[PDB]
């Protein structure tokens, strides 16, 4: 939700990376009011 | 490309947020071969 996912650094596991990828997806679409 | 883009801490400002988006999306499709 409203809250900035944890990024285990630079050489994070692609698949926990995706993972990222999913609730930074889900963040932005909160943020940015799903305008993009 | 075949790079872990930079992240600017967690207090980083939406658009570059979303820029960080744009180019984890493209490693994340280029790691992945494209597979997601």
Do not use: K, M, W
């Not at 990828?21 to 909160?30: A, G």
């Amino acid at each position: 939700g409203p809250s900035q996912p944890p990024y285990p650094g630079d050489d994070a596991p692609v698949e926990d990376l995706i993972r990222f990828y999913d609730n930074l997806q889900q963040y932005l679409n909160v943020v940015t009011r799903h305008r993009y």
